[PDB]
Amino acid sequence: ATVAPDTRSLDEIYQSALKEGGTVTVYAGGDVQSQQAGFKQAFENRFPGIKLNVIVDYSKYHDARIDNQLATDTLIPDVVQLQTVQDFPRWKKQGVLLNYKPVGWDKVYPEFRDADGAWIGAYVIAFSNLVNTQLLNEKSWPREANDYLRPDLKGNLILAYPNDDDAVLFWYKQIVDKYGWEFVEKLQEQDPVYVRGTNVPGAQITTGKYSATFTSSGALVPAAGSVTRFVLPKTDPFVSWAQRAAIFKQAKHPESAKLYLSWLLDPQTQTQVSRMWSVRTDVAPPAGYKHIWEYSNTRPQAFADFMSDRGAVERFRAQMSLYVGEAKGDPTPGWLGLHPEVPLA
Ligand SMILES: [Mg+2]
Numbered sequence: 535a536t537v538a539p540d541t542r543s544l545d546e547i548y549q550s551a552l553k554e555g556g557t558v559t560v561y562a563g564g565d566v567q568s569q570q571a572g573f574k575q576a577f578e579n580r581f582p583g584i585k586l587n588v589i590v591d592y593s594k595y596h597d598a599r600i601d602n603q604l605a606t607d608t609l610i611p612d613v614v615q616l617q618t619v620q621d622f623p624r625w626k627k628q629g630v631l632l633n634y635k636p637v638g639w640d641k642v643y644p645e646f647r648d649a650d651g652a653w654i655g656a657y658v659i660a661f662s663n664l665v666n667t668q669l670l671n672e673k674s675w676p677r678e679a680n681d682y683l684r685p686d687l688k689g690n691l692i693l694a695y696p697n698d699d700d701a702v703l704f705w706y707k708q709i710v711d712k713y714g715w716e717f718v719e720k721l722q723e724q725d726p727v728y729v730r731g732t733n734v735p736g737a738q739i740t741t742g743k744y745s746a747t748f749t750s751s752g753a754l755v756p757a758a759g760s761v762t763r764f765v766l767p768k769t770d771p772f773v774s775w776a777q778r779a780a781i782f783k784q785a786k787h788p789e790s791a792k793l794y795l796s797w798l799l800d801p802q803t804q805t806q807v808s809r810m811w812s813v814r815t816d817v818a819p820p821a822g823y824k825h826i827w828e829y830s831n832t833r834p835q836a837f838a839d840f841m842s843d844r845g846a847v848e849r850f851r852a853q854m855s856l857y858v859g860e861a862k863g864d865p866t867p868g869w870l871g872l873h874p875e876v877p878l879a
Contacts, residue, residue: 537651539639540796547637547796548581551789557585558790559875561600563593563616563777565731565866567877576807577797584790589877591867593618594700602872604630610875612791615656615779617701620841622778626652632781632788637796638814643827645835646776646813655776656798658811658826658834661705661732662772663765664750666739675763676746678770679709683720691726692735692744696854698861699732700847701773702749704840707850708771718857728858731866736762749773753809754820767831774826775837776813 540547551558562570567590577586591599593616600621603609616622625631626648635651646655665675669690676682682691696703709717727744729735735747740762752764766772779798781791797803804812811819811826819825826834840847855861868878 535633535650537633537635539635540637540792542637542796544580544637544793544796544800547789547793548584551581551584551787551793554787554790556583557587558613558787558794559611560586560588560613560615560794561596561611562588562590562614563596563618564590565592565733566590567867569733573807576803577794580797581793584793586794587876589870589874591870591874592699592865595865595867595870597621599870599872599874600625604628608873609782609784610873611782612785612787613779613781613794615777617659617775617777618841619775619778619838620844622648622653622780625780626650630783632783632785632791634781634792634795636792636799638799638801641814641816642799643813643815643825645827653778653780654795654799655813656779656795657804657808658774658776658813659701659751660764660766660772660774660810660826660832661701661749661751662767663746663748664736664739664752665746665763665765666742666744666761667763668761669742669745675765676748677765677767679713679717679748679767680770682746682748683717683724687745688724690745691724692738692747693726693728694732694735694747694749695728695730695861696749696858697851698730700841700851701775701837702732703847703851703854704837705749705771705773706854707840708773708836710850712771718854722857728861730861730863733866751810754811754823755809766829769831772832773837774811774829774832775834 570588574586597618631652633651694702736750
């Protein structure tokens with residue numbers, strides 16, 4: 535089906551959405567439900583009477599959950615938004631996605647959108663250095679990969695399990711490409727602490743238990759008095775991608791789903807709610823930064839290309855497992871089962 539970019543205002547979409555019962559359900563990729571709390575609060579304040587029933591789980595479990603619900607005709611969500619970006623062209627070809635070009639679709643950087651409107655990049659996430667600014671002075675913030683091998687960072691590092699999250703894994707793929715397996719070998723001698731949940735390193739660094747990590751997201755504009763800082767490398771690669779979102783063809787609440795996606799793309803949402811880069815060409819990067827596509831030391835399309843070859847990803851993941859061990863501990867989102875209809879208690 536051929537569609538044109540939505541020309542309606544948010545309020546015009548919103549009045550139309552209100553007829554649907556006052557709830558839109560979103561299966562969103564993430565480590566913990568709290569990561570979506572800001573979006574939920576902003577959305578529900580902006581559109582009174584419509585609840586953003588967003589449900590967080592690892593992307594690698596949400597996509598399987600959607601595949602199984604499709605197979606059994608028990609589909610629950612209106613919208614899916616994940617970092618497993620290779621799923622979206624597959625679901626498109628399967629015919630289960632609603633072609634919709636949201637408000638602002640024309641301004642989305644072309645590689646961050648499906649040409650027919652089958653899916654859209656919602657916002658940009660990047661994984662790189664996160665440092666404790668009270669433990670480390672600015673001149674000593676580690677920024678390059680080999681900075682983490684210096685003696686005064688031994689025992690002071692906490693890291694997300696690369697074998698539990700493919701975006702984390704891709705950071706290592708790039709670094710091994712450049713510096714070889716010797717980097718991973720030397721890194722283990724630093725006695726890093728590995729954890730599940732990409733939220734956890736930043737959480738424990740904030741409390742002062744660790745000094746730094748190199749596979750974390752973070753605010754480009756930190757809040758006043760923040761003890762942490764997201765810091766890019768000067769030269770070394772970092773990971774970035776556009777989180778992908780789509781509406782299902784069988785969505786029970788298509789107008790509300792449309793509202794959500796159009797709201798995500800709004801310039802205010804892109805700069806005031808989303809905490810990193812925007813997918814839009816007409817949205818200024820935060821002061822001090824360039825557009826994500828202007829950094830020579832990251833390539834969002836490289837993550838997508840990586841994720842398309844499951845065999846290559848698996849082989850690299852398995853080798854990393856031999857260096858860091860099996861991913862230990864409980865899954866941070868909790869265990870949602872096959873048919874979560876609301877967030878966990
Ligand atoms: Mg030792």
